[PDB]
Amino acid sequence: AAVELAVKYINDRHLPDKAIDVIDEAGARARLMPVSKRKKTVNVADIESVVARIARIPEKSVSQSDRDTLKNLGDRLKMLVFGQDKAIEALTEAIKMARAGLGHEHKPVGSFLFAGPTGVGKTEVTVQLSKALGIELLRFDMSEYMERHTVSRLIGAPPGYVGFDQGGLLTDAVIKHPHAVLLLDEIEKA
Amino acid sequence: LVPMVIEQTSRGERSFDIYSRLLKERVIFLTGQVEDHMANLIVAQMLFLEAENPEKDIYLYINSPGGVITAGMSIYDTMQFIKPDVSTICMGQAASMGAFLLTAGAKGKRFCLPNSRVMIHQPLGGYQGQATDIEIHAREILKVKGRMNELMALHTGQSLEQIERDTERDRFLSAPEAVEYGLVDSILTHR
Amino acid sequence: LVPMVIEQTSRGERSFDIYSRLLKERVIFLTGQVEDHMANLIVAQMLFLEAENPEKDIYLYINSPGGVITAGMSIYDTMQFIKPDVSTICMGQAASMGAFLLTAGAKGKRFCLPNSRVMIHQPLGGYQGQATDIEIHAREILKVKGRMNELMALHTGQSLEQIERDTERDRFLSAPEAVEYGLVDSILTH
Amino acid sequence: LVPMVIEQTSRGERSFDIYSRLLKERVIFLTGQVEDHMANLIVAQMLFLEAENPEKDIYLYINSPGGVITAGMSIYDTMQFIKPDVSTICMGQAASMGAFLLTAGAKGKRFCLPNSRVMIHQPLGGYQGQATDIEIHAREILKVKGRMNELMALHTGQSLEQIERDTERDRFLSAPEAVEYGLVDSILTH
Ligand SMILES: Nc1ncnc2c1ncn2[C@@H]1O[C@H](COP(=O)(O)OP(=O)(O)OP(O)(O)=S)[C@@H](O)[C@H]1O
């Protein structure tokens, strides 16, 4: 679990050193936290705590904890959104489908095209889904990327041309938060 | 001499004729004497608009001084067949076909302007040749008149006898008077 | 002037004439006195639609007062040859050739509007000149009428003797009465 | 031919016609004899401008020798119905339905050029046929005649009796006289 979780969440560091870091930290935390419990064994629970803290995420990387939220993900979401209940079922099932480990390795967790008239609340579902799943939120507007030369702002300008040094906002944000939710408003205008 | 208008649509700016832009908003323009050629454009616009959005209601201006009975009926049948409610506004002038198509709009949606003049007369047709042929042709013109009065009665709601008396001779109806007759409804006059 | 209507496509909107967009939807309109150029124009449209789709029906709206008989034969021979059934919706007047064109329509797809009127009469190709040449011209017109009546009875199914008796003088049929005579199989109202 | 003018827009250079360029600035040209087709074109231009910016004022330049009274009434009705103040600048000449639409313009914005010449006369319509038909058509000309006097007296502000006597015979009014008469508020100043 420690090696698999570090590669899945701790992308900045390499596998040989980062994996030992999790094992080393779990030993120190497994010894400090118990108060008369004498829980010498190091279960998967301790691994989740250290990886989360060192990954700077809100408890997303935990085992058997997400299943509780997945069980009632639509329920807790319906309390912050009113209407479009049918959409919640499609979105929540695909999320669980991807999280079950049955998805494809060379594709994202799930690609969706929310379609509805303006103001229905698709952005609200996304701003609440990220807080629920403990992931960051990436927001982009394709209204400013309708030109031919503006497309390079997402992936970055080619070498030897203006805009190369800072890079692309899309790839940069993804590398900074590989577990965030990507939101692209008004994709048709792109 | 058709001016061009720029539409600031999403992802681009496109130039279209003044008439074409209004067709995007389901605003058809009927002008001049009705004929087989101009009728195809109105019919084409109605069918095209239906495919784009059956829910939206089509609009139809009427500024015609008359026209052919055969070509006029095509607009009437096409208007009724299309699901969208076809509004019937009258600008400047109305005639036998202008008034026949004016009253075919969905009840309530049809409207009229304050200074519009509605002329309702019986169909006029002339044929020459062999006496026997004129007799057959004579029956046709009578039947067309009968088909016009009954359909007009359905929309206006007036009895067939009353309309026939007025229709037999040239008749003119003012915009306020037309509302009482039932040809049209008054304009909202709200800004 | 013909209004330009934009047809939305994935690449982007492309402006097209009202008639052009209708052709895209398999809708072909016919109007005005039949002419060789007019007949050949409708012929090119029929061939293009067949190649685009060989199964979908091609609508043919006839709102003409009649024209040259020879020009009409070209349209009739092109309609029978094409595999897709032609939907001859009569939206108004239909003279001798108008009736012939709609009757040629495939059975089961011919429609008529409630207030439409179909006028059927015999052909008139009257020519004046030397009696010797008139003999061949006189013989020719009867052959076309016989050929047209034979093909007309094949489509409708009425007795040939009755058709010629009726067609000798101008006949006017109403839309309700037209279906009784067999000109149009059904009526389109909704 | 109509000259083409270029507009300086930040996005890119946009080609325009001389009439279309001025149409983009809420300027309508009522040039030539009043006619059904030409009048309908003006009606569309008014609606287009109203939707773009109802708060702005639509300008109308009336330089016409008169025409069909029925067609002109269409311009009069739409002008009042639309919220934008329809300014009326009479350039060069005015006649029946030219002056009527000139006075119909919103108060406080009507104007006349220094050398412009107005002309107002009673509608001249003649009908031929059976005596019964002349009686109905003759009465209609009396109704519309009175209807123009009533509406002309409203915008102009003159008494009903004065308008009937003046309109009975053709009257030519100079631009200074027009201000005194009431057809226009004032003459344009450099
Ligand atoms: N169904 C909803 N339930 C709860 N709050 C909503 C709902 N719809 C809109 N809101 C609120 O309205 C705010 C403004 O709407 P936006 O989120 O800007 O809409 P939008 O994302 O542009 O709309 P679409 O339809 O998704 S393009 C949201 O952020 C919510 O606070």
PDB file of N, CA, C and O and ligand atoms in Angstrom, chain A residues 80-84 116-124 185-186, ligand 1:
ATOM      1  N   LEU A  80     -26.539  19.934  -1.016  1.00  0.00           N
ATOM      2  CA  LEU A  80     -25.941  21.191  -1.443  1.00  0.00           C
ATOM      3  C   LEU A  80     -26.355  21.578  -2.858  1.00  0.00           C
ATOM      4  O   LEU A  80     -25.900  22.611  -3.361  1.00  0.00           O
ATOM      5  N   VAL A  81     -27.199  20.778  -3.510  1.00  0.00           N
ATOM      6  CA  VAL A  81     -27.675  21.032  -4.864  1.00  0.00           C
ATOM      7  C   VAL A  81     -29.132  20.596  -4.923  1.00  0.00           C
ATOM      8  O   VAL A  81     -29.500  19.556  -4.368  1.00  0.00           O
ATOM      9  N   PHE A  82     -29.957  21.387  -5.606  1.00  0.00           N
ATOM     10  CA  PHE A  82     -31.391  21.136  -5.714  1.00  0.00           C
ATOM     11  C   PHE A  82     -31.775  21.117  -7.184  1.00  0.00           C
ATOM     12  O   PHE A  82     -31.664  22.136  -7.873  1.00  0.00           O
ATOM     13  N   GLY A  83     -32.257  19.967  -7.641  1.00  0.00           N
ATOM     14  CA  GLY A  83     -32.612  19.736  -9.027  1.00  0.00           C
ATOM     15  C   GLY A  83     -31.545  18.904  -9.706  1.00  0.00           C
ATOM     16  O   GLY A  83     -30.539  18.521  -9.101  1.00  0.00           O
ATOM     17  N   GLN A  84     -31.801  18.609 -10.988  1.00  0.00           N
ATOM     18  CA  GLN A  84     -30.918  17.797 -11.846  1.00  0.00           C
ATOM     19  C   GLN A  84     -30.451  16.536 -11.117  1.00  0.00           C
ATOM     20  O   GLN A  84     -29.284  16.144 -11.183  1.00  0.00           O
ATOM     21  N   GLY A 116     -26.255  21.256 -20.251  1.00  0.00           N
ATOM     22  CA  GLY A 116     -27.479  21.815 -19.730  1.00  0.00           C
ATOM     23  C   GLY A 116     -27.484  23.318 -19.929  1.00  0.00           C
ATOM     24  O   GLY A 116     -26.432  23.922 -20.153  1.00  0.00           O
ATOM     25  N   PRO A 117     -28.654  23.957 -19.866  1.00  0.00           N
ATOM     26  CA  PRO A 117     -28.689  25.414 -20.032  1.00  0.00           C
ATOM     27  C   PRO A 117     -27.915  26.108 -18.921  1.00  0.00           C
ATOM     28  O   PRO A 117     -27.726  25.570 -17.829  1.00  0.00           O
ATOM     29  N   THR A 118     -27.442  27.313 -19.231  1.00  0.00           N
ATOM     30  CA  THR A 118     -26.655  28.091 -18.281  1.00  0.00           C
ATOM     31  C   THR A 118     -27.416  28.334 -16.982  1.00  0.00           C
ATOM     32  O   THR A 118     -28.626  28.575 -16.984  1.00  0.00           O
ATOM     33  N   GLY A 119     -26.688  28.261 -15.867  1.00  0.00           N
ATOM     34  CA  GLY A 119     -27.243  28.496 -14.554  1.00  0.00           C
ATOM     35  C   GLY A 119     -27.831  27.291 -13.850  1.00  0.00           C
ATOM     36  O   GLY A 119     -28.255  27.425 -12.695  1.00  0.00           O
ATOM     37  N   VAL A 120     -27.892  26.129 -14.504  1.00  0.00           N
ATOM     38  CA  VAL A 120     -28.463  24.943 -13.866  1.00  0.00           C
ATOM     39  C   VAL A 120     -27.668  24.571 -12.621  1.00  0.00           C
ATOM     40  O   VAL A 120     -28.240  24.107 -11.625  1.00  0.00           O
ATOM     41  N   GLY A 121     -26.347  24.757 -12.656  1.00  0.00           N
ATOM     42  CA  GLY A 121     -25.495  24.445 -11.521  1.00  0.00           C
ATOM     43  C   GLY A 121     -24.448  23.377 -11.750  1.00  0.00           C
ATOM     44  O   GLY A 121     -24.066  22.684 -10.801  1.00  0.00           O
ATOM     45  N   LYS A 122     -23.982  23.213 -12.991  1.00  0.00           N
ATOM     46  CA  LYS A 122     -22.948  22.215 -13.244  1.00  0.00           C
ATOM     47  C   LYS A 122     -21.665  22.585 -12.511  1.00  0.00           C
ATOM     48  O   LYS A 122     -20.956  21.708 -12.002  1.00  0.00           O
ATOM     49  N   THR A 123     -21.350  23.882 -12.449  1.00  0.00           N
ATOM     50  CA  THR A 123     -20.168  24.330 -11.719  1.00  0.00           C
ATOM     51  C   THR A 123     -20.309  24.065 -10.227  1.00  0.00           C
ATOM     52  O   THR A 123     -19.314  23.789  -9.547  1.00  0.00           O
ATOM     53  N   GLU A 124     -21.534  24.139  -9.701  1.00  0.00           N
ATOM     54  CA  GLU A 124     -21.748  23.890  -8.280  1.00  0.00           C
ATOM     55  C   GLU A 124     -21.495  22.426  -7.953  1.00  0.00           C
ATOM     56  O   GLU A 124     -20.948  22.104  -6.892  1.00  0.00           O
ATOM     57  N   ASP A 185     -14.930  25.621 -18.849  1.00  0.00           N
ATOM     58  CA  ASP A 185     -16.213  26.248 -19.117  1.00  0.00           C
ATOM     59  C   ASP A 185     -16.337  26.645 -20.580  1.00  0.00           C
ATOM     60  O   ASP A 185     -15.401  27.187 -21.173  1.00  0.00           O
ATOM     61  N   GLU A 186     -17.517  26.401 -21.145  1.00  0.00           N
ATOM     62  CA  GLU A 186     -17.830  26.738 -22.531  1.00  0.00           C
ATOM     63  C   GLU A 186     -16.813  26.123 -23.495  1.00  0.00           C
ATOM     64  O   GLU A 186     -16.108  26.813 -24.234  1.00  0.00           O
TER      65      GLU A 186
HETATM   66  N1  LIG E   1     -29.132  23.747  -8.535  1.00  0.00           N
HETATM   67  C1  LIG E   1     -28.498  24.577  -7.713  1.00  0.00           C
HETATM   68  N2  LIG E   1     -28.445  24.275  -6.394  1.00  0.00           N
HETATM   69  C2  LIG E   1     -27.807  25.117  -5.571  1.00  0.00           C
HETATM   70  N3  LIG E   1     -27.186  26.258  -5.854  1.00  0.00           N
HETATM   71  C3  LIG E   1     -27.255  26.532  -7.167  1.00  0.00           C
HETATM   72  C4  LIG E   1     -27.876  25.767  -8.135  1.00  0.00           C
HETATM   73  N4  LIG E   1     -27.744  26.361  -9.381  1.00  0.00           N
HETATM   74  C5  LIG E   1     -27.058  27.451  -9.149  1.00  0.00           C
HETATM   75  N5  LIG E   1     -26.735  27.620  -7.827  1.00  0.00           N
HETATM   76  C6  LIG E   1     -25.978  28.719  -7.241  1.00  0.00           C
HETATM   77  O1  LIG E   1     -25.843  29.743  -8.204  1.00  0.00           O
HETATM   78  C7  LIG E   1     -24.439  30.079  -8.324  1.00  0.00           C
HETATM   79  C8  LIG E   1     -24.162  30.734  -9.655  1.00  0.00           C
HETATM   80  O2  LIG E   1     -24.345  29.780 -10.732  1.00  0.00           O
HETATM   81  P1  LIG E   1     -23.033  29.287 -11.513  1.00  0.00           P
HETATM   82  O3  LIG E   1     -22.339  28.233 -10.716  1.00  0.00           O
HETATM   83  O4  LIG E   1     -22.231  30.477 -11.927  1.00  0.00           O
HETATM   84  O5  LIG E   1     -23.664  28.627 -12.831  1.00  0.00           O
HETATM   85  P2  LIG E   1     -22.958  28.022 -14.134  1.00  0.00           P
HETATM   86  O6  LIG E   1     -21.987  26.979 -13.699  1.00  0.00           O
HETATM   87  O7  LIG E   1     -22.504  29.144 -15.009  1.00  0.00           O
HETATM   88  O8  LIG E   1     -24.184  27.277 -14.839  1.00  0.00           O
HETATM   89  P3  LIG E   1     -24.168  26.081 -15.915  1.00  0.00           P
HETATM   90  O9  LIG E   1     -25.632  25.835 -16.176  1.00  0.00           O
HETATM   91  O10 LIG E   1     -23.598  24.962 -15.086  1.00  0.00           O
HETATM   92  S1  LIG E   1     -23.113  26.603 -17.469  1.00  0.00           S
HETATM   93  C9  LIG E   1     -23.759  28.741  -8.035  1.00  0.00           C
HETATM   94  O11 LIG E   1     -22.365  28.868  -7.782  1.00  0.00           O
HETATM   95  C10 LIG E   1     -24.566  28.322  -6.807  1.00  0.00           C
HETATM   96  O12 LIG E   1     -24.175  29.046  -5.661  1.00  0.00           O
END
